[PDB]
Amino acid sequence: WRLSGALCLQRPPLITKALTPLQEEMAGLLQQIEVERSLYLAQDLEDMWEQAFLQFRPGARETEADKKNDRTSLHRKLDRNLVLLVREKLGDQDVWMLPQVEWQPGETLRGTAERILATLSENNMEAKFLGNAPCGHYKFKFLGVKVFFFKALLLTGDFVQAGKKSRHVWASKEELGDYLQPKYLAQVRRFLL
Amino acid sequence: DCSRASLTRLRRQAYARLYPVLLVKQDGSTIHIRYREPRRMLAMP
Amino acid sequence: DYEYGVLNIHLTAYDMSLAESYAQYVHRLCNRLSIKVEESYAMPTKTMLTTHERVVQISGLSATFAEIFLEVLQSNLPRLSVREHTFKARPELEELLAKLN
Amino acid sequence: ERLEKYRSFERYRRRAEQEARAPHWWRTYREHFRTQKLLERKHF
Amino acid sequence: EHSPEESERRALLLKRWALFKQQEHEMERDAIRSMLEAQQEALEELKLESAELYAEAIKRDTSLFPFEKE
Amino acid sequence: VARKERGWATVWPNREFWHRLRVVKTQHHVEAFVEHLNGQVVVSASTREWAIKKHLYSTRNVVACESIGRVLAQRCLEAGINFMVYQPTPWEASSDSIKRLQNAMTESGVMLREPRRIY
RNA sequence: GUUAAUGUAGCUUAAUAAAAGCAAAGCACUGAAAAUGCUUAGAUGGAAUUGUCCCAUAAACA
């Protein structure tokens, strides 16, 4: 029986999404009471400070509009999390799959997950593994192959070779679902958020 | 949800008026804070 | 089969209210998740400006529970820290005396 | 330990009152001493 | 002193905030249930495949903490 | 001259009452019941009843407690029971709704203090 | 279509004599939490009778 292990890479969003109007009005309410409970040319200095914010380039809340189709680029999304998804081509079946590398019983699951990054990611960016319990097991047969879907969160985002010839795409949830055509893969999104 | 805990009101027992200012970080990120003085922005070196 | 130790969480933020507001918030989530919190201590201001830091005690954790919990904590954050930890009353001792007698 | 402890006296009082009505083997003080209409309600 | 209309306006927006927060709580609670069920479901999946692997896996990692993430 | 339970010194609520008016606040509904020593509810007023709730905007409200108090009083007045003993807990007594409901009983003529038995 | 699921509101073997109780949320409050007060939300997609069909849905076979 063929042995295969999959790593579900995760990246946290850099910047939070904008507040909803109901959040905004509550922000006004807490500010309004904040003034109520508070105890009691500066504008020229204030103008100098406010423009100093403008000159310094700020981190955009969402880079999707600028990136658009830069899926291979690591920072595909800033508002939401990212899942690394890398095409795996095989003779029996060629389908878009999650980062996968063989797994051996002697090597523990975390060690297998580390090898997936060391064998496929091959980049400075680092990921951390929390629990040794797998996040999903899905088997597709033609020959029967079982894939172990481990999970990984990105400690750092120092991606190397952003434009790998390999078809690596970072998809938060939606673009990921489309690629995962087989129902076994489609179910991989059960633990994904 | 980051905004789940970000949005809160001051329940402290009395305090001086705090004005909104941005602590601009060297990587371009910004964070809202309430400061005692009527400033506008702060810069992390 | 081994069980996690009691791990303290140090929440340091620019605003005293925000640090405490997150500190109380995590406790509420901890209580909902059935996480025991022994104490919610506050540290002195870091006089130089100042910074405010609050300890939220956490006791009891599991491998699966750890994975989900910290992930939730990351999203909940609007500076996180996770570290292993480092006068009795009259009734407490009276029971204590009998056991050792 | 695992079971929750009453944080309010009222909930215990409801539990205490419920038990009093419920029968017990030991001697106790008590022993010695359409659809369419509903739809209309929802509319109202 | 705030006028009754001012309190009415502040109360009105308070109702909107409370309604949304309760909706978030249900959504957040359901999200945790989905997260837990999937994670718990993942636990059972490999148990059928090979329970022996879990005996090592279920043991906690002492070196995992202290771990700080933003 | 009817008897009253004069014991239960260590146990609260006191049993020294011919009739006790117990008001129960549920998660969504508030109900008031008058019961005899036997515990049988002679007269019951509940917001869950269709007639009241159709005319009552929100099942749980301070005014709803006021409304049920007046409604129960009329049921009590027509029944002929004018005197009862109500012993709210300290926080229950502090509750404005219970105070408002009690005010309805007083204005409606219902008295929450019964007279002591005569020998 | 075969196997298999899933069908009162988070929970209940609450209910067919009247769609209930509990859990849960927010606000006031201040060590924290809790309590307390003011408030917020919801269902039988469903027919059986006790204390399986049923169509729908969605899976392995297909």
Swiss-Prot record, chain A:
UniProt keyword Transit peptide, yes or no: yes
Keywords: Acetylation, Mitochondrion, Ribonucleoprotein, Ribosomal protein, Transit peptide
Modified-residue entries (N6-acetyllysine), positions: 146
N6-succinyllysine modified-residue sites: 164
Superkingdom of origin: Eukaryota
A GO CC annotation given for this chain: nucleoplasm
Gene Ontology terms describing biological process: mitochondrial translation
Keyword Transit peptide applies: yes
Gene Ontology molecular function: any one: structural constituent of ribosome
Subunit architecture: Component of the mitochondrial ribosome large subunit (39S) which comprises a 16S rRNA and about 50 distinct proteins.
Family membership noted in the UniProt record: Belongs to the mitochondrion-specific ribosomal protein mL46 family.
Name this polypeptide is given: Large ribosomal subunit protein mL46
Organism: Mus musculus
Curated annotation (Swiss-Prot), chain B:
Domain of life according to the entry: Eukaryota
Subunit organization: Component of the mitochondrial ribosome large subunit (39S) which comprises a 16S rRNA and about 50 distinct proteins.
Similarity comment text for this entry: Belongs to the mitochondrion-specific ribosomal protein mL55 family.
Natural source organism: Mus musculus (Mouse)
Localization annotation: Mitochondrion
Protein name (database record): Large ribosomal subunit protein mL55
UniProtKB/Swiss-Prot annotation, chain C:
Location of N6-succinyllysine modifications: 88
Subcellular location: Mitochondrion
Family: Belongs to the mitochondrion-specific ribosomal protein mL48 family.
Name of the molecule in the record: Large ribosomal subunit protein mL48
Gene for this chain: Mrpl48
Assembly mode: Component of the mitochondrial ribosome large subunit (39S) which comprises a 16S rRNA and about 50 distinct proteins. Interacts with OXA1L.
Source species: Mus musculus (Mouse)
Full protein segment contained here: 84 to 211 of 211
Transmembrane segments: none
Swiss-Prot record, chain E:
Domain of life: Eukaryota
Subcellular location: Mitochondrion
Tissue expression per record: Ubiquitous.
Subunit relationships: Component of the mitochondrial ribosome large subunit (39S) which comprises a 16S rRNA and about 50 distinct proteins.
Family: Belongs to the mitochondrion-specific ribosomal protein mL40 family.
Protein name, entry field: Large ribosomal subunit protein mL40
